[PDB]
Design a protein around this ligand. Structure first.
Ligand code: SF4
Ligand code: SF4
Ligand code: FES
Ligand code: FES
Ligand SMILES: [Fe+3]
Ligand SMILES: [Fe+3]
Lengths: 634, 634
């Protein structure tokens, strides 16, 4: 019963093929892991020193406390903090790499890169306080890249990619609680110090540190989006397709997979130059397709079709038609390197700090980006040739996807209804009930949850209740692969009020039809775009974020990055659902802080709920409580 | 049988008292934890994402691989890397705090702090390339503090507290392998990124990253020593005492405990100002005593007696005479906060990122250091008053300790035998066999090992074989508490050749007697002093460190900091014993890299050996192999 594993029919088809071919998948490796350790599941395990491992029984008799005296409270809080720091390290490492890419570009060191979005560059410079009048664009961009790098360490200002992106009233609440990061890598290191043995051992103190480090993660996300938009262009609405049926047996199929699109944006453009070289090898052309967030990035900017997402990533290879899988970093199952030998896929790593035994490595360098891309595409072409005459099994399953809803694009779309107060039509429709509130779906799939089931179950209920739904990362992937980004499905999925608004906006944008049921706001760092939108609404209304009818749902969360995002969503003031258990239930006091008393600090709070129908009800109640707090009917 | 728990008779006496009083200790919490998890012991557990916890059976059947595909190799290497990063975060967080203290001092912002060692300041400035001629000391010190802070992030130079402290030939070997850190907090964050799910998945690549992050840890250690010496003075030989008998029933007993002595150095001086206030409360005075490395710091600089060390720290409180325990951060068992209620000790935290539930917090600030110290000592005095009339049980057990052997002091002592080539007498005696080689004992005690048993067993065998033994941290604590820093024990402990050299040096220093059997080089960051000595010998000889007959032994290792130190000892070229199992044995390939093939990268290697007699033999063989490589008899 492949339906217990994934709700995606293309994935189910490939699961049957993998089974008959004897290829182990993530779902088989999960089954082999059961029953999983209950100490780890509940957070009641510590390996922070060589006196361990230590554990605490959730209930019963000894052990009741760690060897050094660490309580369940401390152990749970320390483990959570390290997960936040690791997520911050990934989003901010991505951003740091792009800051170096921009600096190289404008110093003349890598002419394949350039300022593509001059408007974004100037706006970011203005937001940071960097002078633009009289200045060359290359100098403004050097100052922006220098400011980005400076936010990684202590200096005479706090992290500007926090303080300049949230409203002053929110910054004031956070500063009063000591939560504004001093430097991104500074906070990561401070977490690792304070959570090491014999240091911080007070749950409230530890968790305040975690909230602060989650804002370091937010800064990394926002910095990453900003810099990628400068370098590669700010997304605007685009139409494409998703799911495995976007692979083409007669083409060279090249997946771009990971998070940082610094090379894969170049691969997109070079692949078109090599169409005749591909034709000489017997292919129709080079068919670049996306996996995970590198896929989101090229989908949002170029309409490159999305093949698949996190938990089901191996299934692209099982088709037999995936000639190359070009990897950067984050969320890549290392199984891909062994599956590649079974499927004939060439798996290629490109980042120095993310290699996989058995995968060919290309030493990507911005200065050589075009030549690296051609070397990689030539390996893919050679791989296509080797599968001449071999049948493939591409499920003939795909959806239509309208995407590219950056915050700038959303504002522009709304401006067609109110040119000089673009947010007002959205607010008007929240007030009159046509839009009940806003829900951001974010984060990953998780093998513990039948793939996409929580995202689609929750989304369906919210849409019928007139919630405006936006999505990023694998949440966007889940929704796109089930038709939620096809405007043809508005009548079926949306309540009458939401349908009326999506139709009014779409008709004013010349579409003869509505916006899609769900707005794709991009990759995981692009959760920062949702922050920009919500902060803009807060500023337009003169209220803080914790008064707005806006929630988030990491409905199938997996990565440390998703824990970090959920933690800053709480910290900026949002009710934040998580649909998998984080390792917290072994401490009632920590659980109570994260789900209840943090409301008194930041206004936000976690909603931990594994049943998706129940989670939908709790998210609706959170939205409605915010409506009532504003004096609105609900 | 308290002898199974600690070889320290004072500790055994307090273990009997704790047992009859019903006070749980670290040894009782260890017993309650048995049997410990074998997945964690071997390294074959991963909790890096919410699909976990994952584990791998060391032997047998499934599970054989993590859910995402991570092999045993990857899981073990990732866990080790995070431990190195956490150790780097602690030593370097200490150093960063002292850099801010120095900056405050010379900016006029905290007049309790000052440049005490102007010679050290000028030498550090010269080593870094900072101009001194014509410059005010306060300006030279601002530039030194700015350079210290700059080494935490990327810039146009690598980490100077690596590249300027090792010989050029060693820097060249490390650079050729990509091992020179770009920035301290940069590397910490990169480790956390690369070890997060779906990133680096090649054991060799992961472990190269770990070696590089271990050099970030070395930079933090060296920076910490440098800055503490500027601010507080470079140690010189001093005579004091150790063990619980240094507590005095008729005095206010105040322990300073942690690692960063920024406040506790001030407490030492203020305590003497308050002698009449203590007398008015019925005490003879204020008796400051050391625990762990804050204790090492004040012992090395001021001869403050050391009460106890890591694993036995609770036993100071069990005496009933410990009126206050003043905490900074690292290596503090959080049990102290609950034991304090049973024993009448006031436990006081002082650092913002290291609090303990149930302990009073004082918001220490450099600008208020004297007033904070008086507030703290007044709480201690009030606590002493509350124990008027209550019997105490201080074991009447102490040793004589000669300490204060900074590298500068060792060079000065040797200079009495050769004024203008001070290292030559040491080298001469290595060549003629009076000194077989050098062994650094470093790192902690660990509840799994009867306290001090490995340190003293190994040291005894090495000393009889004419090894010059130096020690830091809890290694120094172990050795001092068993008489190894009392020159009266040279005849008993030392081989004839070593005795002859220790006597010759001592007699030339006017002592009428030898140097002590073991030279105390200070706190854990002061392992950097041993690097300075070994690098100076390498430079004098014109060879790299991996040719020298010098080894290290973390004989009872515990903290992530000790894993980091052991890892940079290997990276700089030393055979490095560890006497507890780190979580590596679940991967033979990783074990083989760390104990064998790393020799081909850096020249150093781990020696994992839990039996101390066997470890002594293996350390001797390592020393002797180095002698033979130099053409020397052995
Ligand atoms: S830090 Fe404490 S709880 Fe954690 S492993 Fe070490 S002794 Fe156990
Ligand atoms: S990172 Fe891989 S091995 Fe680790 S918990 Fe997640 S699925 Fe398991
Ligand atoms: S005891 Fe299983 S996660 Fe540690
Ligand atoms: S299974 Fe015990 S340490 Fe994770
Ligand atoms: Fe993503
Ligand atoms: Fe120490």
């Amino acid at each position: 019963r492949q339906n217990l594993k994934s709700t995606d029919r293309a994935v189910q088809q490939m699961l049957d093929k993998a089974k008959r071919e004897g290829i182990q998948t993530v779902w088989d490796r999960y089954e082999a892991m059961k029953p999983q350790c209950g100490f780890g599941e509940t957070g009641l395990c510590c390996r922070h020193c060589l006196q361990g491992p230590c554990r605490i029984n959730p209930f019963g008799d000894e052990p009741k406390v760690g060897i050094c005296g660490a309580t369940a409270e401390v152990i749970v809080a320390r483990g959570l903090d390290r997960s936040i720091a690791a997520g911050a390290a990934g989003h901010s490492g991505h951003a740091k790499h792009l800051a170096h890419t921009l600096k190289k570009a404008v110093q003349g060191k890598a002419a394949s890169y350039m300022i593509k979005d001059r408007t974004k560059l100037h706006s970011i410079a203005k937001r940071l306080g960097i002078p633009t009048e009289g200045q060359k664009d290359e100098d403004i961009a050097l100052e922006v890249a220098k400011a980005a790098l400076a936010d990684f360490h202590e200096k005479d200002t706090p992290v500007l990619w926090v303080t300049t992106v949230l409203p002053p009233s929110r910054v004031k609440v956070l500063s009063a609680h000591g939560l504004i990061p001093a430097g991104i890598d500074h906070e990561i290191a401070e977490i690792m110090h304070r959570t090491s043995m014999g240091c911080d051992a007070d749950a409230q103190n530890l968790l305040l540190g975690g909230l602060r480090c989650s804002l370091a993660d937010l800064a990394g996300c926002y910095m990453g989006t900003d810099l990628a938009d400068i370098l590669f262009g700010t997304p605007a609405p685009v139409v494409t397709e998703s799911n495995l049926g976007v692979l083409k047996a007669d083409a060279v199929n090249v997946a771009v997979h990971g998070h940082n699109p610094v090379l894969s944006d170049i691969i997109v453009s070079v692949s078109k130059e090599m169409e005749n070289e591909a034709r000489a090898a017997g292919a129709t052309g080079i068919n670049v397709v996306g996996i995970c967030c590198t896929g989101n990035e090229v989908l949002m900017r170029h309409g490159i079709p999305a093949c698949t997402h996190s938990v089901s990533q191996e299934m692209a290879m099982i088709t037999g038609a995936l000639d190359a899988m070009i990897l950067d970093y984050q969320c890549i199952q290392p199984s891909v390197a062994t599956i590649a030998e079974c499927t004939g896929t060439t798996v290629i790593t490109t980042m120095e700090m993310s290699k996989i035994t058995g995968a060919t490595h290309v030493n990507f360098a911005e200065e050589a980006a075009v030549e690296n891309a051609k070397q990689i595409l030539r390996l893919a072409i050679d791989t296509f040739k080797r599968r001449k005459g071999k049948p493939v099994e591409i499920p003939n399953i795909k959806t239509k996807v309208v995407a590219g809803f950056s915050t700038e694009a959303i504002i522009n779309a709304l401006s067609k209804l109110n040119a000089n107060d673009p947010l007002k039509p959205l607010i008007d429709n929240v007030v009159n009930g046509n839009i009940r509130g806003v829900c951001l779906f974010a984060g990953c799939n998780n093998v513990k949850v039948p793939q996409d089931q929580n995202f689609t179950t929750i989304a369906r209920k919210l849409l019928k209740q007139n919630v405006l739904v936006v999505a990023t990362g694998c949440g966007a992937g889940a929704l796109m692969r089930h038709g939620f980004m096809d405007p043809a499905n508005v009548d079926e999925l949306c309540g009458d009020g939401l349908k009326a608004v999506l139709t009014a906006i779409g008709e004013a944008n010349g579409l003869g039809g509505p916006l899609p049921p769900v707005l794709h706001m991009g990759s995981c760092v692009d959760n920062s775009r949702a922050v920009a939108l919500v902060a803009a609404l807060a500023n337009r209304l003169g209220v803080d974020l914790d008064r707005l009818p806006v929630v988030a749902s990491a409905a199938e969360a997996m990565h440390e990055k998703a824990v970090a995002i959920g933690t800053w969503a709480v910290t900026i003031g949002l009710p934040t659902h998580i649909g998998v258990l984080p390792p917290i239930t072994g401490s009632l006091p920590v659980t109570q802080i994260l789900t209840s008393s943090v409301k008194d600090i930041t206004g936000g709070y976690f909603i931990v709920e594994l049943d998706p129908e129940t989670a939908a009800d709790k998210l609706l109640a959170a939205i409605n409580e915010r409506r009532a707090g504003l004096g609105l009917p609900w």
